[PDB]
């Protein structure tokens, strides 16, 4: 039932309700002659919504806001980008124009600026050291250490036992490393073990791209990273 990359036309966004007040958003982008899905999260915060990650570009993110308006009907008041790449910050300008307060760690904000990407406005304190966690409305934000990127955060929704890994967690059908240009391959398994140690109770683990699963996705990701290391 989870929407697959083959069912979403680029420019369109789907929502998938995981638990009471918890949804993933799924969009697609064309990249190098292939089409890739991408996930983010939506978490109900009283009578408002917290958005985790853009929908990978301005057009998709505008479509995301329209689909939230239509299907949920509560305002997106805050958004967090989990690292500085375009599948997470691309669309921040759209969100800001719509009155969404955008947030990222100071590490992510700096890297986005260096990369010429869109820059979330507000800085999230308390995430500078591996293993740091902070509460942000209805979620917990966790910096596990460098992995897919040096700034990558993961997000836990305690009420639903939902762990969103962003691009630091791969889906099971991904057997080779994705974009690792900005990755710390040497630290990535250690960072994943920090995630496992902090959220052993997680029931629903969402990768940055593709199908959700259980905590098996963490060991899967380590396997793929280590195999790539030994390439
Ligand atoms: C575009 C930029 O956002 C990328 C990034 O975030 O590194 C996107 N995400 C990933 C990932 O591996 O998680 C990609 C893998 C396929 C690309 C070859 S494309
Ligand atoms: Zn990335
Ligand atoms: Zn503000
Ligand atoms: Zn990605």
Short mmCIF file of C-alpha atoms and ligand atoms in Angstrom, two decimals:
data_model
loop_
_atom_site.label_atom_id
_atom_site.label_comp_id
_atom_site.label_asym_id
_atom_site.label_seq_id
_atom_site.Cartn_x
_atom_site.Cartn_y
_atom_site.Cartn_z
CA UNK A 1 0.00 0.00 0.00
CA UNK A 2 2.90 2.48 0.42
CA UNK A 3 3.22 4.54 -2.78
CA UNK A 4 6.11 3.38 -4.96
CA UNK A 5 8.27 5.49 -7.23
CA UNK A 6 6.28 4.19 -10.21
CA UNK A 7 2.90 5.56 -9.04
CA UNK A 8 3.82 9.24 -8.48
CA UNK A 9 4.31 11.59 -11.44
CA UNK A 10 7.05 14.14 -10.83
CA UNK A 11 5.36 17.30 -9.62
CA UNK A 12 2.78 15.27 -7.68
CA UNK A 13 2.91 14.44 -3.97
CA UNK A 14 1.22 11.68 -2.00
CA UNK A 15 0.62 11.46 1.74
CA UNK A 16 0.64 8.16 3.63
CA UNK A 17 -0.79 8.05 7.15
CA UNK A 18 1.45 5.95 9.40
CA UNK A 19 -0.21 6.56 12.74
CA UNK A 20 -2.61 8.94 14.43
CA UNK A 21 -1.26 12.37 13.52
CA UNK A 22 1.73 11.00 11.60
CA UNK A 23 2.15 10.92 7.83
CA UNK A 24 4.95 10.53 5.36
CA UNK A 25 5.02 12.65 2.24
CA UNK A 26 6.29 11.05 -0.97
CA UNK A 27 7.37 12.87 -4.13
CA UNK A 28 9.55 12.05 -7.15
CA UNK A 29 12.35 13.76 -9.00
CA UNK A 30 14.14 12.93 -12.25
CA UNK A 31 17.89 12.64 -11.79
CA UNK A 32 20.47 11.54 -14.39
CA UNK A 33 17.80 9.93 -16.57
CA UNK A 34 16.19 8.00 -13.70
CA UNK A 35 13.20 8.77 -11.47
CA UNK A 36 13.67 8.59 -7.71
CA UNK A 37 11.12 8.76 -4.89
CA UNK A 38 11.75 10.74 -1.76
CA UNK A 39 10.14 10.71 1.69
CA UNK A 40 9.56 13.29 4.37
CA UNK A 41 7.35 13.48 7.44
CA UNK A 42 4.31 15.42 8.67
CA UNK A 43 3.56 15.35 12.40
CA UNK A 44 0.46 16.88 13.98
CA UNK A 45 1.35 19.43 16.70
CA UNK A 46 -1.90 20.35 18.42
CA UNK A 47 -3.95 22.14 15.77
CA UNK A 48 -0.87 22.76 13.59
CA UNK A 49 1.53 20.61 11.58
CA UNK A 50 5.29 20.16 11.77
CA UNK A 51 6.91 19.32 8.41
CA UNK A 52 10.13 17.29 8.20
CA UNK A 53 11.91 18.00 4.91
CA UNK A 54 10.81 19.57 1.70
CA UNK A 55 9.46 17.56 -1.24
CA UNK A 56 12.66 17.98 -3.30
CA UNK A 57 12.26 21.23 -5.18
CA UNK A 58 10.02 24.30 -5.33
CA UNK A 59 7.31 22.79 -7.54
CA UNK A 60 6.98 19.60 -5.53
CA UNK A 61 7.00 21.54 -2.25
CA UNK A 62 4.24 23.88 -3.43
CA UNK A 63 2.33 20.74 -4.44
CA UNK A 64 3.03 19.30 -0.98
CA UNK A 65 1.51 22.34 0.74
CA UNK A 66 -1.55 22.09 -1.51
CA UNK A 67 -1.94 18.37 -0.79
CA UNK A 68 -1.67 18.96 2.98
CA UNK A 69 -4.28 21.74 2.73
CA UNK A 70 -6.61 19.41 0.82
CA UNK A 71 -6.14 16.17 2.77
CA UNK A 72 -5.40 17.35 6.31
CA UNK A 73 -6.49 20.98 6.47
CA UNK A 74 -4.26 22.09 9.31
CA UNK A 75 -1.56 24.76 8.87
CA UNK A 76 2.11 23.86 8.49
CA UNK A 77 3.71 26.25 10.97
CA UNK A 78 7.25 24.87 11.21
CA UNK A 79 9.56 22.79 9.07
CA UNK A 80 12.89 21.12 9.78
CA UNK A 81 15.40 20.14 7.10
CA UNK A 82 17.50 17.12 8.10
CA UNK A 83 20.53 17.91 5.95
CA UNK A 84 21.74 20.50 3.48
CA UNK A 85 21.08 18.74 0.15
CA UNK A 86 18.37 19.69 -2.32
CA UNK A 87 16.03 16.80 -1.47
CA UNK A 88 15.74 18.31 2.03
CA UNK A 89 16.10 22.10 1.60
CA UNK A 90 14.93 22.48 -1.99
CA UNK A 91 11.61 24.20 -1.46
CA UNK A 92 12.55 26.14 1.69
CA UNK A 93 11.92 29.41 -0.15
CA UNK A 94 8.40 28.21 -1.01
CA UNK A 95 7.74 27.28 2.61
CA UNK A 96 9.07 30.60 3.89
CA UNK A 97 6.92 32.52 1.41
CA UNK A 98 3.88 30.61 2.76
CA UNK A 99 4.63 31.68 6.34
CA UNK A 100 6.23 28.41 7.47
CA UNK A 101 9.08 28.96 9.92
CA UNK A 102 12.01 26.93 8.58
CA UNK A 103 14.66 25.35 10.78
CA UNK A 104 17.93 23.47 10.47
CA UNK A 105 21.07 22.98 12.50
CA UNK A 106 23.76 25.64 12.13
CA UNK A 107 25.87 22.96 10.44
CA UNK A 108 23.19 22.36 7.83
CA UNK A 109 22.64 26.11 7.35
CA UNK A 110 26.36 26.66 6.72
CA UNK A 111 26.68 23.75 4.28
CA UNK A 112 23.59 24.85 2.39
CA UNK A 113 25.06 28.32 2.00
CA UNK A 114 28.39 26.97 0.76
CA UNK A 115 26.52 24.75 -1.71
CA UNK A 116 24.38 27.62 -2.96
CA UNK A 117 21.24 25.84 -1.79
CA UNK A 118 18.22 27.30 -0.04
CA UNK A 119 18.90 28.15 3.60
CA UNK A 120 16.40 27.47 6.42
CA UNK A 121 15.94 30.60 8.49
CA UNK A 122 16.18 29.45 12.09
CA UNK A 123 19.04 27.60 13.72
CA UNK A 124 18.46 24.52 15.88
CA UNK A 125 20.73 24.58 18.93
CA UNK A 126 21.81 21.54 20.90
CA UNK A 127 22.69 19.15 18.04
CA UNK A 128 26.39 19.84 17.45
CA UNK A 129 27.85 16.66 19.01
CA UNK A 130 27.22 13.05 18.01
CA UNK A 131 24.52 11.58 20.24
CA UNK A 132 22.83 14.91 20.96
CA UNK A 133 19.03 14.96 21.07
CA UNK A 134 16.52 17.80 21.46
CA UNK A 135 12.71 17.92 21.56
CA UNK A 136 11.10 20.00 18.81
CA UNK A 137 7.34 20.11 19.28
CA UNK A 138 5.99 16.57 18.92
CA UNK A 139 9.26 15.03 17.68
CA UNK A 140 12.76 14.41 18.94
CA UNK A 141 15.67 15.48 16.73
CA UNK A 142 18.86 13.41 16.98
CA UNK A 143 22.30 14.04 15.56
CA UNK A 144 23.82 10.55 15.30
CA UNK A 145 27.13 11.66 13.85
CA UNK A 146 28.31 11.94 10.27
CA UNK A 147 26.87 9.42 7.81
CA UNK A 148 25.25 10.30 4.47
CA UNK A 149 26.43 13.84 5.27
CA UNK A 150 28.24 15.44 8.19
CA UNK A 151 25.13 17.33 9.33
CA UNK A 152 22.46 14.65 8.94
CA UNK A 153 19.73 14.53 11.58
CA UNK A 154 17.17 11.84 12.25
CA UNK A 155 13.70 12.37 13.69
CA UNK A 156 11.72 10.27 16.15
CA UNK A 157 8.00 10.60 16.85
CA UNK A 158 7.59 9.15 20.38
CA UNK A 159 3.79 8.88 20.26
CA UNK A 160 3.83 6.66 17.16
CA UNK A 161 7.26 4.94 17.57
CA UNK A 162 8.18 6.27 14.10
CA UNK A 163 11.84 6.79 13.26
CA UNK A 164 12.59 8.86 10.18
CA UNK A 165 16.16 8.38 9.03
CA UNK A 166 16.38 10.66 6.07
CA UNK A 167 19.18 9.85 3.66
CA UNK A 168 21.31 8.23 6.40
CA UNK A 169 19.01 5.15 6.20
CA UNK A 170 18.56 3.19 2.99
CA UNK A 171 15.54 1.13 1.98
CA UNK A 172 15.94 -2.65 1.70
CA UNK A 173 15.72 -2.68 -2.10
CA UNK A 174 18.77 -0.39 -2.31
CA UNK A 175 21.77 -2.68 -2.56
CA UNK A 176 24.46 -0.19 -3.57
CA UNK A 177 25.38 3.16 -2.08
CA UNK A 178 23.53 6.23 -3.30
CA UNK A 179 25.12 9.69 -3.45
CA UNK A 180 28.11 9.50 -1.12
CA UNK A 181 30.03 12.55 -2.33
CA UNK A 182 29.50 14.31 0.99
CA UNK A 183 29.36 11.22 3.18
CA UNK A 184 31.60 10.05 6.02
CA UNK A 185 31.74 6.38 5.08
CA UNK A 186 34.15 5.68 7.95
CA UNK A 187 31.75 6.99 10.59
CA UNK A 188 28.43 5.97 9.03
CA UNK A 189 28.14 2.53 10.70
CA UNK A 190 29.02 4.07 14.07
CA UNK A 191 26.41 6.75 13.56
CA UNK A 192 23.82 4.07 12.72
CA UNK A 193 24.67 2.19 15.90
CA UNK A 194 24.02 5.43 17.82
CA UNK A 195 20.55 5.49 16.24
CA UNK A 196 19.91 1.85 17.19
CA UNK A 197 21.09 2.50 20.74
CA UNK A 198 18.81 5.55 21.15
CA UNK A 199 15.64 4.22 19.47
CA UNK A 200 15.59 0.42 20.04
CA UNK A 201 11.82 0.68 20.47
CA UNK A 202 11.14 2.18 17.02
CA UNK A 203 8.41 0.22 15.18
CA UNK A 204 8.29 2.03 11.79
CA UNK A 205 11.56 3.20 10.16
CA UNK A 206 11.33 5.49 7.15
CA UNK A 207 14.34 5.85 4.83
CA UNK A 208 15.05 9.02 2.92
CA UNK A 209 14.05 7.23 -0.31
CA UNK A 210 11.71 4.26 -0.77
CA UNK A 211 9.75 1.84 1.36
CA UNK A 212 9.51 1.94 5.16
CA UNK A 213 10.36 -1.07 7.24
CA UNK A 214 11.54 -1.98 10.70
CA UNK A 215 14.84 -1.49 12.49
CA UNK A 216 16.32 -4.04 10.06
CA UNK A 217 16.80 -1.06 7.73
CA UNK A 218 19.61 0.14 10.00
CA UNK A 219 21.71 -3.04 9.71
CA UNK A 220 20.85 -3.17 6.00
CA UNK A 221 22.29 0.35 5.57
CA UNK A 222 25.48 -0.59 7.44
CA UNK A 223 25.85 -3.68 5.26
CA UNK A 224 25.57 -1.58 2.10
CA UNK A 225 27.92 1.13 3.39
CA UNK A 226 30.56 -1.40 4.50
CA UNK A 227 30.33 -3.23 1.20
CA UNK A 228 30.84 0.08 -0.57
CA UNK A 229 33.80 0.83 1.72
CA UNK A 230 35.42 -2.44 0.68
CA UNK A 231 34.70 -1.80 -3.02
C1 LIG B 1 19.90 15.50 -4.90
C2 LIG B 1 20.51 15.28 -3.50
O1 LIG B 1 19.51 15.69 -2.55
C3 LIG B 1 20.83 13.82 -3.24
C4 LIG B 1 21.44 13.66 -1.76
O2 LIG B 1 20.70 14.06 -0.83
O3 LIG B 1 22.57 13.16 -1.65
C5 LIG B 1 19.56 12.88 -3.40
N1 LIG B 1 19.43 11.88 -2.42
C6 LIG B 1 20.18 10.82 -2.60
C7 LIG B 1 20.61 9.77 -1.46
O4 LIG B 1 21.49 8.89 -1.79
O5 LIG B 1 20.04 9.87 -0.37
C8 LIG B 1 20.37 10.45 -3.99
C9 LIG B 1 20.73 9.27 -4.57
C10 LIG B 1 20.79 9.02 -6.00
C11 LIG B 1 21.69 10.02 -6.70
C12 LIG B 1 22.80 9.40 -7.50
S1 LIG B 1 19.70 11.88 -4.92
ZN1 LIG B 2 21.86 14.14 0.73
ZN1 LIG B 3 10.81 32.93 12.29
ZN1 LIG B 4 18.64 11.67 -0.51
#
